[model samples]
Target chain A: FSWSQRKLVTVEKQDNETFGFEIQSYRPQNQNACSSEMFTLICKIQEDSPAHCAGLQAGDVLANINGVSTEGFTYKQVVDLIRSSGNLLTIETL
Target chain B: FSWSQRKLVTVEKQDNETFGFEIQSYRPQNQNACSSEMFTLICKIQEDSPAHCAGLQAGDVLANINGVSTEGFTYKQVVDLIRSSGNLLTIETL
Candidate 1:
């Protein structure tokens, strides 16, 4: 028994704004040794920030952003997507 | 749309040993602002380590370990549970 359940997270604000959270691309030390790739991890969520208010927590993984799979996106690409998502941000997790 | 899907992870090794993973009790900065409590989050999973080999990821959360609910246990208590679970560890996740 060594499998962790995966998850998907959607973030949006009633004010119609950005989801205030930080994400980093998943890069295993060996890269080829692990199964997770091309995904993003939630690094930080500012207290009372839009993201925190939306239930985003630290360490949450993001599998998709704005209907785009995070499977092949770079950290910068994910950042850009979040910035451009305008009023709504949808994410998948595992 | 701010709720993140929660998951439970079970870690064990075929070598008849402890599951190799790290867990930290959920602690909100505000203490009263967030809904998550008494639960633990997977902070790190060593590559090829017993826990990693068991499929645990760096961000997986643990809701139970060894049939014991993490709902009210302290961080130290949860650590003890894992350390003493013998060759097999069963965990539940949200």
Candidate 2:
């Protein structure tokens, strides 16, 4: 079976609650990780967290947060985006 | 001035030629880039290449390939898409 090329991840949390995951740049040991410079990987989706319940995984890559493309972004930029997301995080990932 | 939130970069290439640019991820030492899996950035648009003439820059990101979203794609995936672009490689970059 062919895998879905992209996945849409939608999860909602209160203003004070966490989505249960963080984004990070992938560090590959040998193979080029998705052609290099491809940061924005979703990581540490805490067990039983909203993101976990939404089926997000550590291996996933972030495509869009809300509606903004994460293409060519750095770590701080992503973190800031997450912090500003308020509630309701709709994510697109691979 | 307010920058355009997203950009669309389109280029065409022949079967026997190159688009004069490659895609790469961004690496930051102290600052955050965009939000970060923010790969798909356009780079190395060779001088006098079609891409250069089209106004592409190293800071641009890949938003789509042809009609496909480069959101969460890997390097090979992106490359294959380019190869299959036929003689008219219409691309969308941010």
Q: Candidates' lDDT values, in order? A: 0.60, 0.66
TM-score: model 2 vs. ground truth: 0.45
> Which lDDT tens digits does candidate 2 get at residues A9-92?
789886787888766664322233234444556645677989989888765678798899997777678778887878878889
The C-alpha stretches of model 1 lying farther than 4 A from their native spots are A1-8, A14-18, A31-33, B1-94
Span of 10 residues, lowest total lDDT, candidate 1 chain B = B28-37
The TM-scores, one per candidate, come to: 0.46, 0.45
Could you give the TM-score of chain B for each candidate, in order? 0.71, 0.74
Q: A5-80 in candidate 1: lDDT tens per residue?
A: 4555566776654466666554432222234335556666777877777666665667666777777777677777
lDDT of 1 by residue, B38-94 (tens): 455566666777777665665456666677767777767877777787767776654
For the predicted complex of model 1, DockQ is 0.06
Each candidate's iRMS in angstroms?
9.9, 13.9
Deviation in Å, model 2, residue A5 alpha carbon: 6.3
